[PDB]
Design a protein around this ligand. Structure first.
Ligand SMILES: *C(=O)CC[C@H](NC(=O)CC[C@H](NC(=O)CCCCCCCCCCCCCCC)C(=O)O)C(=O)O
Length: 29
């Protein structure tokens, strides 16, 4: 889907939604 808006418009989320919640615990121990 959105083969034209599924990549570019997908580089400003995981790297903050899959990194924040993550790196949020990784550094909590
Ligand atoms: C996020 O779900 C994908 C959104 C992304 N594009 C944008 O961030 C901007 C367009 C808009 N996005 C938003 O406003 C935020 C949407 C959040 C919805 C989250 C629901 C859960 C889905 C999780 C999917 C896995 C993604 C990795 C997260 C660990 C929009 O939604 O269109 C895009 O590429 O669509």
């Amino acid at each position: 889907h959105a083969q034209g808006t599924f990549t570019s418009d997908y580089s400003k989320k995981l790297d903050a939604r899959r990194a924040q919640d993550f790196v949020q615990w990784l550094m909590n121990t």
